Amino acid sequence: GAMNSSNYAELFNNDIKLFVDDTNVYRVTVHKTFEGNVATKAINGCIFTLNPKTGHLFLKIIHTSVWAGQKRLSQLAKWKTAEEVSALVRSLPKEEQPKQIIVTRKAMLDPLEVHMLDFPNIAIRPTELRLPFSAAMSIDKLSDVVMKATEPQMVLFNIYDDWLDRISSYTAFSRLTLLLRALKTNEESAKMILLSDPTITIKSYHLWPSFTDEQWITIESQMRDLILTEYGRKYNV
């Protein structure tokens, strides 16, 4: 059923599973019309579909043209997400298809369940974890490819870069969730921590800087400080 702190090592077992986050699918700017009314303008979005064991990220870019002439876009976005996830699964060889799909928001359960009725052996589950995947658009290279897209497009990334050569998938997922929580809590300070030192660079084929093991422990500590503080500056404590 629902996924929570009690069954957390399950993410890193050998059953293929994907997280789906739909928070960046339908994105808008809200603005005033010439007549003084309010209107929305959509901007490109993305589905964040992530294998937490391997780091494989299937980033389906959602071009604004998919909304042209449609009503109830927030509702449509959930069904569009489910259609794209279904299509992704159907495109995979059987031995690569997930045994579970975990949605980060419960409103995605019925749309995904309906689109996957053809796959009765794939479990569709919610989670009680508050995962910071909405911050994926604070990662510069991901934001860049989403905003430059002129058509619907799927782009593949490893969100762990080369980390699994040195750490476990449990540790990599913890590092990712820490980084994304920090970016969600205070994007500016978070991004200052990650690039403060000009000698540490991001490889052309990576998303994050090439920190040594030691530098990562420092970085991780600085992200913890940020999250504890900003929570300070937030609750006054």
Binding site: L76, D110, V114, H115, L117
Partner: protein, 300 residues
Amino acid sequence: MNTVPFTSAPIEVTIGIDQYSFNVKENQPFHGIKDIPIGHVHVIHFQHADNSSMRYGYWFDCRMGNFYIQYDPKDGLYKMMEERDGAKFENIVHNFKERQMMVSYPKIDEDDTWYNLTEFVQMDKIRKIVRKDENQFSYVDSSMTTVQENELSDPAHSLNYTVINFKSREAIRPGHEMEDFLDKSYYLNTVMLQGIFKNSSNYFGELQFAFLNAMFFGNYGSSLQWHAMIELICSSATVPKHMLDKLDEILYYQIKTLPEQYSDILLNERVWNICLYSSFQKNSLHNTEKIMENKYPELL
């Protein structure tokens, strides 16, 4: 006006006949029910004084045979049976009437309640739903399960209601996932009405029968079926106008007749609030909404 005589009443029992009921004491000189209106199905039901567990009873139509009740001391229940000897039956009944050993079906002349609850409930529809093809009458009790319940365990003793499941391949056309899930008109009009049920009269028959088994026997599965069949219509944007008008009348009389102190288990809060206030048909059930709001405003 037909009669269902009883051999005797050896155990204390509350006997229901349609929406009426009366108490019979152990070994009281009771020999059945007379003046039963011809033209309608009827249900005669039983609740033992010593075991309020298990209500059970029999759906029947006096036009289809001569039926009587006889207590069975081995199986511990009042059994309905058919008498094939027509002349013998007539003679038994005449003598019991002469000795005034029968209660009268106590229908008020103005009163159309039973008609309004059974407009689409005929024996031929009841027989498709309930099986003992050797009898012209059908047994139902509180614990009998439905076909859908047995897929989620004795098959002979089951209710054949059509399995309605909104998240099922039959309900959802490939490539119309969102459309068919948010608007059930395909499911109602094409899968259920045109293919399994054939017309709205068979559909209404199963809907009314499910309600009555829920109300009279506390049959869990029948309670679910009744609500599922209401929700399928209310969640369809496209429903023939004549079905909507008839559904409103059907539900009105069911809500009017429901026992007030059973309203908490027999009525599903979610289904009724969705149907009355959110669904495509939220504005199409005026009589039903008015009686619900005046009798069960707590539920809503």
